[PDB]
Amino acid sequence: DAKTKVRELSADKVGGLVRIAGQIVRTHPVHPELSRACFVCEDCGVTTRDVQQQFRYTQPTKCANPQCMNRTRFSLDVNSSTFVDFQKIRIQETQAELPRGSIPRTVDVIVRGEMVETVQPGDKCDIVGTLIVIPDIAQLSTPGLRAETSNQSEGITGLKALGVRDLTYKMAFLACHIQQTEYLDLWSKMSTEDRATLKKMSDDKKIEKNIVDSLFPNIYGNHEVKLGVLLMLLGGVAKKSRDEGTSLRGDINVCLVGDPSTAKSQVLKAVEEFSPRAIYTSGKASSAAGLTAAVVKDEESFEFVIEAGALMLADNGVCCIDEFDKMDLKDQVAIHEAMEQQTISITKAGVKATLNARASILAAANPVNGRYDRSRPLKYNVQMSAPIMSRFDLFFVLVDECNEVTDYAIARRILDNHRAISEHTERDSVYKIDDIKKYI
Amino acid sequence: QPRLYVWGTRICVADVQRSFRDFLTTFKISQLAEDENMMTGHDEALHEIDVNHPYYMERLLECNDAEVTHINLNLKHLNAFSEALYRKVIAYPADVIPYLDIVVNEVFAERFNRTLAQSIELRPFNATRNMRGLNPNDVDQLITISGMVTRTSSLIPEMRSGYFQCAVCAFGIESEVDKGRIEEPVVCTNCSNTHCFQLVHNRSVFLDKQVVKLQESPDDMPSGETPHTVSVYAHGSLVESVQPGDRITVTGIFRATGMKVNPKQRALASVYRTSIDALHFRKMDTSRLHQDNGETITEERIQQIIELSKRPDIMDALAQSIAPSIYEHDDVKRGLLCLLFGGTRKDDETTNKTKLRSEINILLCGDPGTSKSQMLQYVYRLLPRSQYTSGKGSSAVGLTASVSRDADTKQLVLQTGALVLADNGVCCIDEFDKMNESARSVLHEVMEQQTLSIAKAGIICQLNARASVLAAANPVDSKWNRNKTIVENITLPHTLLSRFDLIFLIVDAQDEMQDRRLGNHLVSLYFEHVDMNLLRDYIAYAKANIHPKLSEEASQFIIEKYLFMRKAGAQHGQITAYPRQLESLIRLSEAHAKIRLSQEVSVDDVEKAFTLWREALKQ
Amino acid sequence: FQELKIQELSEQVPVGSIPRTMTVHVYGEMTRKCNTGNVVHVSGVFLPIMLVADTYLEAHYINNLDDNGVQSAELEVLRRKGDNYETLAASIAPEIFGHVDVKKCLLMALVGGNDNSSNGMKIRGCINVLMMGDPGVAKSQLLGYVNRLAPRSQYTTGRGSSGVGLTAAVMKDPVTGEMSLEGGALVLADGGICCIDEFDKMMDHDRTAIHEVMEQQTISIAKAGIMTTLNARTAIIAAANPAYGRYNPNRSIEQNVDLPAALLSRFDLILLMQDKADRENDKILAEHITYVHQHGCHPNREKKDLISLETLREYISLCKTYTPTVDPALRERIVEAYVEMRRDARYSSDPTFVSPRMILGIVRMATARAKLRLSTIVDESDVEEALRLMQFAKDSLRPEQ
DNA sequence: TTTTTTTTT
Numbered sequence A: 001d002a003k004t005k006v007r008e009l010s011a012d013k014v015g016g017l018v019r020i021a022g023q024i025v026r027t028h029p030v031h032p033e034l035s036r037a038c039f040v041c042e043d044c045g046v047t048t049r050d051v052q053q054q055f056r057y058t059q060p061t062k063c064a065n066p067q068c069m070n071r072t073r074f075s076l077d078v079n080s081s082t083f084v085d086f087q088k089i090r091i092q093e094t095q096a097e098l099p100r101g102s103i104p105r106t107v108d109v110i111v112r113g114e115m116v117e118t119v120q121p122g123d124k125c126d127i128v129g130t131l132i133v134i135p136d137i138a139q140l141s142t143p144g145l146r147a148e149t150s151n152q153s154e155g156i157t158g159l160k161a162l163g164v165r166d167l168t169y170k171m172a173f174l175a176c177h178i179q180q181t182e183y184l185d186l187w188s189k190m191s192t193e194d195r196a197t198l199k200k201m202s203d204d205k206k207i208e209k210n211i212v213d214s215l216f217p218n219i220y221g222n223h224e225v226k227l228g229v230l231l232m233l234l235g236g237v238a239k240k241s242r243d244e245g246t247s248l249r250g251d252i253n254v255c256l257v258g259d260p261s262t263a264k265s266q267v268l269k270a271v272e273e274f275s276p277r278a279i280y281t282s283g284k285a286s287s288a289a290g291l292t293a294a295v296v297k298d299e300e301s302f303e304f305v306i307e308a309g310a311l312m313l314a315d316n317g318v319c320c321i322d323e324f325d326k327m328d329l330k331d332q333v334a335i336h337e338a339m340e341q342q343t344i345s346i347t348k349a350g351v352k353a354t355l356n357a358r359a360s361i362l363a364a365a366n367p368v369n370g371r372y373d374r375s376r377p378l379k380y381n382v383q384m385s386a387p388i389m390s391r392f393d394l395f396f397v398l399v400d401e402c403n404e405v406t407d408y409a410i411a412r413r414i415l416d417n418h419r420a421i422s423e424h425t426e427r428d429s430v431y432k433i434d435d436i437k438k439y440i
Numbered sequence B: 001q002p003r004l005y006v007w008g009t010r011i012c013v014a015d016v017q018r019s020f021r022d023f024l025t026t027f028k029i030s031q032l033a034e035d036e037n038m039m040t041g042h043d044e045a046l047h048e049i050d051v052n053h054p055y056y057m058e059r060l061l062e063c064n065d066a067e068v069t070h071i072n073l074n075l076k077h078l079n080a081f082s083e084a085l086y087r088k089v090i091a092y093p094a095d096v097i098p099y100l101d102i103v104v105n106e107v108f109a110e111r112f113n114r115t116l117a118q119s120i121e122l123r124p125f126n127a128t129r130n131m132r133g134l135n136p137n138d139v140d141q142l143i144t145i146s147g148m149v150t151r152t153s154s155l156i157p158e159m160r161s162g163y164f165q166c167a168v169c170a171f172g173i174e175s176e177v178d179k180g181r182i183e184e185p186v187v188c189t190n191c192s193n194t195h196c197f198q199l200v201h202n203r204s205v206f207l208d209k210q211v212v213k214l215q216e217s218p219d220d221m222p223s224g225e226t227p228h229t230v231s232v233y234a235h236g237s238l239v240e241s242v243q244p245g246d247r248i249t250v251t252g253i254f255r256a257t258g259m260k261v262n263p264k265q266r267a268l269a270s271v272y273r274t275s276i277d278a279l280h281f282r283k284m285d286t287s288r289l290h291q292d293n294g295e296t297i298t299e300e301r302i303q304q305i306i307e308l309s310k311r312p313d314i315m316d317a318l319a320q321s322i323a324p325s326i327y328e329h330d331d332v333k334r335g336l337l338c339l340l341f342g343g344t345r346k347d348d349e350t351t352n353k354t355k356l357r358s359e360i361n362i363l364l365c366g367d368p369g370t371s372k373s374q375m376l377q378y379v380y381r382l383l384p385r386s387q388y389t390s391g392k393g394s395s396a397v398g399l400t401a402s403v404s405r406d407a408d409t410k411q412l413v414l415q416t417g418a419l420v421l422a423d424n425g426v427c428c429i430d431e432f433d434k435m436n437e438s439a440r441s442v443l444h445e446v447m448e449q450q451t452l453s454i455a456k457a458g459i460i461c462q463l464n465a466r467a468s469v470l471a472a473a474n475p476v477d478s479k480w481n482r483n484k485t486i487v488e489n490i491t492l493p494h495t496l497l498s499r500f501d502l503i504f505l506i507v508d509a510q511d512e513m514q515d516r517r518l519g520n521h522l523v524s525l526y527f528e529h530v531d532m533n534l535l536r537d538y539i540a541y542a543k544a545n546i547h548p549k550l551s552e553e554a555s556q557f558i559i560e561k562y563l564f565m566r567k568a569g570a571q572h573g574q575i576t577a578y579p580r581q582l583e584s585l586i587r588l589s590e591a592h593a594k595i596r597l598s599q600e601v602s603v604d605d606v607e608k609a610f611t612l613w614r615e616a617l618k619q
Numbered sequence C: 001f002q003e004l005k006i007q008e009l010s011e012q013v014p015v016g017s018i019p020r021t022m023t024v025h026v027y028g029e030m031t032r033k034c035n036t037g038n039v040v041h042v043s044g045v046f047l048p049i050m051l052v053a054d055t056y057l058e059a060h061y062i063n064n065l066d067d068n069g070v071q072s073a074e075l076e077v078l079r080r081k082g083d084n085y086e087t088l089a090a091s092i093a094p095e096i097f098g099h100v101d102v103k104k105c106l107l108m109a110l111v112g113g114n115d116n117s118s119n120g121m122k123i124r125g126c127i128n129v130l131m132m133g134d135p136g137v138a139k140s141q142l143l144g145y146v147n148r149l150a151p152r153s154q155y156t157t158g159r160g161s162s163g164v165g166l167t168a169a170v171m172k173d174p175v176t177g178e179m180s181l182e183g184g185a186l187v188l189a190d191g192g193i194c195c196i197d198e199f200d201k202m203m204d205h206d207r208t209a210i211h212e213v214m215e216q217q218t219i220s221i222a223k224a225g226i227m228t229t230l231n232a233r234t235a236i237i238a239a240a241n242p243a244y245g246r247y248n249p250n251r252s253i254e255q256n257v258d259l260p261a262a263l264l265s266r267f268d269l270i271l272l273m274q275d276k277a278d279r280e281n282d283k284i285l286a287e288h289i290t291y292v293h294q295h296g297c298h299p300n301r302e303k304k305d306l307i308s309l310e311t312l313r314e315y316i317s318l319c320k321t322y323t324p325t326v327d328p329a330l331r332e333r334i335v336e337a338y339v340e341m342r343r344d345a346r347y348s349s350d351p352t353f354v355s356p357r358m359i360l361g362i363v364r365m366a367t368a369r370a371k372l373r374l375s376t377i378v379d380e381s382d383v384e385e386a387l388r389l390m391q392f393a394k395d396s397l398r399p400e401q
Numbered sequence D: 001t002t003t004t005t006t007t008t009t
Ligand SMILES: Nc1ncnc2c1ncn2[C@@H]1O[C@H](COP(=O)(O)OP(=O)(O)NP(=O)(O)O)[C@@H](O)[C@H]1O
Pocket: A218, A219, A220, A221, A258, A259, A260, A261, A262, A263, A264, A265, A266, A267, A366, A410, A413, A414, B448, B495, B579, B580, B583
């Protein structure tokens, strides 16, 4: 129960048991790691066992035979040594941690054994473990290894292995336990409370109204838009041709166009708050690399790697793009090429790959001349290309009605929002949002 | 008798300690004029310092009661006591500071008969120079300089003592690291093997270190110089005590170090790198509205503020005291007063997010030679967190946030812009009509939702930017044209125009009497305003303590006025009103009640806010 | 220790070739004698770095030719004489015939007024001049002479300069990957004069960069990973042609001078220089120019004294040390002049733009002539001379009306 | 690799 914030990881707290929370950015592949080793003396053939490894590959300081003078000439034995499964991960500060005017911090995390590959990018997690310090192991020279800097802000000096060189350190978290922060057999298993509540919800004949009025309590009217977004959350059934390899896409796409102050950004923000795997973006602050997936190369390693961008973190979820019409044509072409195939392809430097991008897109835009013109068809009022416009199941157009009764109703809804916030008071919805989350 | 001397100087350690013990036990002179950030202590919550006692003996009570572990030593007091000791402190800080500490700890232990978790530490401050005026004579001397904080690093562990373990028999030894160097044991005293020990890193002891980058102030400099930057190193309890965007003064030791020609080899370059080891950060400044949530104000000045609030003239008295050199423009001054006060904060505290915007945005649009830039300069100088940008000097990425590749790790990293540095402050944007459209169009998300969401290569996150935007511009033709309407003299998108809470049209009313009065005012510069010290305390107290709520009568009245706004905005050649303007009216009403120090918004407050909004635009 | 890079001077370069550079190491008391944008005389020893070798210059002595209680005897005669204003006006570029009032305007721009900082609000002290005229009337010759006369000054043309070369630039170092700032012409000219030739042919989005410099005397930048403010305390002297290469007497002043009002209000003086054929003046001008081509020097037919360029530079440097204060009795004269000036712009058929910057311009010119007189209190004679020059500048824009 | 800026076509 003793949570600490990421910025509180002082050098005082090395070696103690600590809990922390963060969002995962990268998940490196799996390697075996040496833990306890056996070495054969090349002079006399005796095996020396259980040489415990540090961060660096090490040979014994002395032959186990008491009548032998060797201290250098050794050979490792593989079939007597013990190997450990290993994984390295990077995490980032969650948004609720951040101080005034600040950019999030990042940490490197080490995982071992049965916890390997138990978590994916985009997850938000709690970690229990300890804080450790790891050195710059490339500066040392021993039997069996010379220094990499010799092969190819002030540190510690004095060691036999550090002839003229110096040693510096980095922080890392050595995880002891990691987890995420939050069909008939499953239906049987959620037995008393969940089956009772969800069966009552399934029996409810006005569940459409009762769900939309709880998902969007702060918005008046727009029943068509509310129902369309609710159906977008559920989606259709994806189907594969049994031998052709072709498939029938089950994902639904929605687009919103309308006049200023018609609650487009309100709808998109509400969807991203509700859904478990949804992401929100702005078209003015995005690039084709960051939107869907990107190529990066490492500097701890030196090989090329793939970053899962926002669409792949929202795979089997919703990607919300606000101000879609203000994107560059390059980035719009990248989105259209991904939407056509539901795949992303990479061919750069020394990596080629193909990826999956099964995400539903929700988009918002403003009309070209500032206000929607009813005297022309939809092709002229929106700056999208016709191939991109072909990708959307539903278009919705929102206009200012200039009507006294609707103006009065909108004003009352806004002041009810302000009044409820002013006294910390909930509205009386039919269902809880958590119950709706369980149902969906 | 063996005796200890500082190498090559004939200073003996103990004779300084005698005089400093006398200084601590005896000095009481300056306490009639105790400073703003030094006049309160605490056992619990806050308490006020008494004048009549020896001052540092009084300050030691805070270390006993609240368990504070440091003393801020004002060097002007020491210079008044004895210059012969002040000279030694400034000339040899790397040698005498480890013993004045021990005198403080001795006096504390004698006075209170008590021990603590860490030693009480000294921080000398208020010794001033410029970054360019430093010379090789100043190496290892005490200096103080000032500037703005742009960047801070992550923490670095710095070892003080290592831990060795024998590989053969598991015996273990500690070893202190000193002069930058550790000493490795050779022979194991238990099992008598040689060249046998291995260092265990995580059994050893470390300390915190942080790097801070500091920038020159541009004001003092001679002709043609561009501003410089300096590296400042913070150790221990000073770590993470400052943010980017803050303006500070630093007192520390000026140092110089060598660099290796190759990292592989022993040879050194004969030109040395320089930096500062910090000892004290100060951020107190009396020329601005203060930066500290108003915790330290006395009961008597709180009662003076409460008495001042009962004038019926309170709006005019506060407004006309702002920007005193500017003649007339009283409506614009009242608008700037509303910008300074703001509405009620409305945040989700579980997620630390703004539910609704409470900051007020203002546009000034008018003829040339009407002091719009001067009003921007006054607002820029008044506030603690402020930024000023102008014209085509900005880019869309520089205003918000940028991605760049790191120097050594070669990763892509994110770094701040103007609107993120102006968080809980004001951004002033001059020549607003002459920006690039790409640079101007990123303001929509910040001005409406107070957040900033980014998606670039390997970087997907969201930042908070709770800034207030104040802008100035010309019409399309640079002089206002009477053969055109308001929405043709201004040309901005309706999406941008609807996000301002106030728009001020400033058109030259051509009149001989007004010309003569303004000419007299301008010529006189070559030949009941509220005090700044009271205005600071008034604004800080009001912000910390007043949170207006709407009355039911006011809510009904606000709906009626919004319907009138919707009808008035629909006429030809005029700015249309959206549902956003209802939120604007609520913000202005709360600002008026906040100036009056009232916990409730009244119909009179709504009437004054609506009158100000209407008369700002009917020109 | 300090390090410099030094470039060849233009007269030293061979024909059709670009100048070269060299690295210089400076030690001890010779440091801090130079900054960027200076012309120097250097003595030093040429050495290698410890079989092909790299080299540098180890400086022994440095002298600023920008800079170099002592007074010359020729200046002592002037300082004892007094009444020097007419001779000082005549001594600016004596090869150029006439334009006495234009030379007086340039003489005032070379000195300027006082900076004012009342109650935290700053006001610019220096004077801005815009010249216009028909082709072939010696605008470029006057700008070249002013550039030689001023201590620290820069020269630019409308085509050869970007809005980043005038203000300041972001430089991306390819070796390190770093970003840095690089000061442009108005930064290098800080404390001095910038001359801008062919001012009408600059692009609008390049021209609008000087709006902040001409009134607030700062440059402020927010780009990439940089956010700073730079000082630019410079006077600007500009030259242009009218809107179609010649003045048109059928079109208005605003049509002849094709500049926006916001930019026009930032210039303290605006002048027009015509070329019109006349059978006596053409012969007199031909006599003057042919004498200069004969003898290499101006005629001086009246045998009056004229001042050398070096001692004129010395005298202007002496004039800049004074800060004369305004007499409070001049208030009614200045304010009444401002009101009378503002009446005509309402009630004229061919008006110009007038704004509250005008009265500050009047005060600047009065203090400038007091500095030229080396007095410490402003006189009503100086106020009257400022009003006379402003009246001349106004009347230049309506010839033959 | 990807990102940001200023001159050139
Ligand atoms: N039907 C509605 N019910 C309640 N509030 C509404 C409604 N329509 C608009 N609003 C209000 O309109 C304001 C603007 O909302 P917003 O989400 O920005 O719409 P928008 O169309 O995305 N604005 P923009 O991004 O400029 O086009 C908010 O204060 C909403 O509360």
